[PDB]
Swiss-Prot record:
Changing Y54D: In NS1; also in Noonan patients manifesting juvenile myelomonocytic leukemia. This is Tyrosine-protein phosphatase non-receptor type 11. CDD domains: PTPc-N11, SH2_C-SH2_SHP_like, SH2_N-SH2_SHP_like. Changing Q469E: In NS1 and LPRD1; does not affect subcellular location; decreases protein tyrosine phosphatase activity against CDC73. It is an enzyme of class 3 (hydrolase). The gene is PTPN11. Residues 3-92, 102-201 form the SH2 domain. Keywords: Acetylation, Cytoplasm, Deafness, Disease variant, Hydrolase, Nucleus, Phosphoprotein, Protein phosphatase, Repeat, SH2 domain. GO terms for cellular component: cytoplasm; cytosol; mitochondrion; nucleoplasm; nucleus; protein-containing complex.
Length: 484
């Protein structure tokens, strides 16, 4: 995902495309985002907006991932705009290493040695700005098995006329190019030692007790944006197939036709006809899904029945800012409705300020002893744009949802849906997965927010949409620990 330039201006981008690009050259940049594309020797800037539900390209489609957006237009050519045909042919790759997992720029040689000694294993590496001779770089790698059976090796990286070397051999136009080369082609030391670059040093994992210290570090000039963008740059390792969602008979069952479930995690419906825009999320498991369509309500209840789910988390109104986000899939209080072969009674509604609880009874028509209570938790106060200012309401919601699920024996996945089921839905699941660790393992536990997002983003596409949501996950964990 080199075509993303994290710290570029429109002028720098035109320059880049005009001097180092050709027609069909393109990159993406933070402005909401901008897609910059060279055409007829001039640059078009296509606007992309994400306020927490999806990436909306002006004059184009809605996407779960910036990578999946580029993938779509590079293969599905002619769909990009005066509506004029704009071609993404040639990515212009970024050489700025700020969004790399192994680039701790301003790290001291001593501090980097301690980190690699306390947190590192065999193959933990990092690149830092040169201690004594500035403009140059140091690759520090840990190798081994106070036994002295392990060691931290330093490797000077020279920057000579905007190219990078380890004192010999090839000269790379970026540190990434050098790292990627010496990953596949490891340096072998005198007396045999192979300086293997296995995994970047983990600096994102903290002990839950020290959340307040980390959130304070990430708030300084911010790290929250720096950490998040390092996470966005790995979304390119999660371009898994979504074939079943693109099939003819299934386009009508997607609310956003390009926000599609991964084939390898999707809820397959049996006894029907097997498709729903829904994915199983396994760290208590979850089904992450989109708000119902008119034509998908019957299939939605088939899923809840099949999966033996007794709890539904809805974090959207039916309508937001004049747009439909989810159909009413539940009866009125005290009423009884049939959704295909599925029968749902609405036993009782209990209103709080932030949410409504609906006690629904679900069953198959013709089969009385198939009946189960399915508790629906409809969060009604989530702001139309962005994230709630105070996390207390969302965590109070989570605590009540967790205690209901825990109370039912042989409960299935907690079904979680918003509009497209990736922004708010992914935010809530991820907060719930993290708070759940601190519940089972106490404040003395290892939490690693981006590890958890990447694991959930490999199960459904774009599972945490915004930096605001990303930050809101930290504030949720901070708040939960504070109130303990
Ligand atoms: C200062 C720096 N250049 C940016 C912050 N940083 C990191 C490191 N690692 C992750 C990470 C952790 C687990 C899984 C995944 Cl996929 C990722 Cl990307 C991350 N998001 N940021 C350190 C380097």
């Amino acid at each position: 995902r080199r075509w993303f330039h994290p710290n570029i201006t429109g002028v720098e981008a035109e320059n880049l495309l005009l001097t180092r690009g050709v027609d069909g050259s393109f990159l993406a940049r933070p402005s909401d985002l901008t897609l910059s594309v060279r055409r007829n020797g001039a640059v078009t800037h296509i606007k992309i907006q994400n306020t927490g539900d999806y990436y909306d390209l002006y004059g184009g489609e809605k996407f779960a991932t910036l990578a999946e957006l580029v993938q779509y237009y590079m293969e599905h050519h002619g769909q990009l705009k005066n509506g004029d045909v704009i071609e993404l042919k040639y990515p212009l790759n970024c050489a700025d290493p700020t969004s790399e997992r192994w680039f701790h720029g301003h790290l001291s040689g001593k501090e980097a040695e301690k980190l690699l000694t306390e947190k590192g294993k065999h193959g933990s590496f990092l690149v830092r700005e040169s201690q004594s001779h500035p403009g140059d770089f140091v690759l520090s790698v840990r190798t081994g098995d106070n036994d002295g059976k392990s060691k931290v090796t330093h490797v000077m990286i020279r920057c000579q006329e905007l190219k990078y070397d380890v004192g010999g051999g090839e000269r790379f136009d970026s540190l990434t190019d050098l790292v990627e080369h010496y990953k596949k082609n490891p340096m072998v030391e005198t007396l045999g030692t192979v300086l293997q670059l296995k995994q970047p040093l983990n600096t994102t994992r903290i002990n839950a007790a020290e959340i307040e210290s980390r959130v304070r570090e990430l708030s300084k000039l911010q790290g929250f944006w720096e950490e998040f963008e390092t996470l966005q740059q790995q979304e390119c390792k999660l371009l898994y197939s979504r074939k079943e969602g693109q099939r003819q008979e299934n386009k009508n069952k997607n609310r956003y036709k390009n926000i599609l479930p991964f084939d390898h995690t999707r809820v397959v419906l049996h006894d029907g006809s097997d498709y729903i825009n829904a994915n199983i999320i396994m760290p208590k498991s979850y089904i992450a899904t989109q708000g119902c369509l008119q034509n998908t309500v019957n299939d939605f209840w088939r899923m809840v029945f099949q999966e033996n789910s007794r709890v539904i988390v809805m974090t959207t109104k039916e309508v937001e800012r004049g747009k439909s986000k989810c159909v009413k899939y539940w009866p009125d209080e005290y009423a009884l409705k049939e959704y295909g072969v599925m029968r749902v009674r609405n036993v009782k509604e209990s209103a709080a300020h932030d949410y409504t609880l609906r006690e629904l009874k679900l069953s198959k028509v013709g089969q009385g002893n198939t009946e189960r209570t399915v508790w629906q938790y409809h969060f009604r106060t989530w702001p139309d744009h962005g994230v709630p200012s105070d996390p207390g309401g969302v965590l109070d919601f989570l605590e009540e949802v967790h205690h209901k699920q825990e109370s039912i024996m042989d409960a299935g996945p907690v079904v979680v849906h918003c509009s497209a089921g990736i922004g708010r839905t992914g935010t809530f699941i991820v907060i719930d997965i993290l708070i759940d660790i601190i519940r089972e393992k106490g404040v003395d536990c290892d939490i690693d927010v981006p590890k958890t997002i990447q694991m959930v983003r490999s199960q459904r596409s774009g599972m945490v949409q915004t930096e605001a949501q990303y930050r809101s996950i930290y504030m949720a964990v901070q708040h939960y620990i504070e109130t303990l």
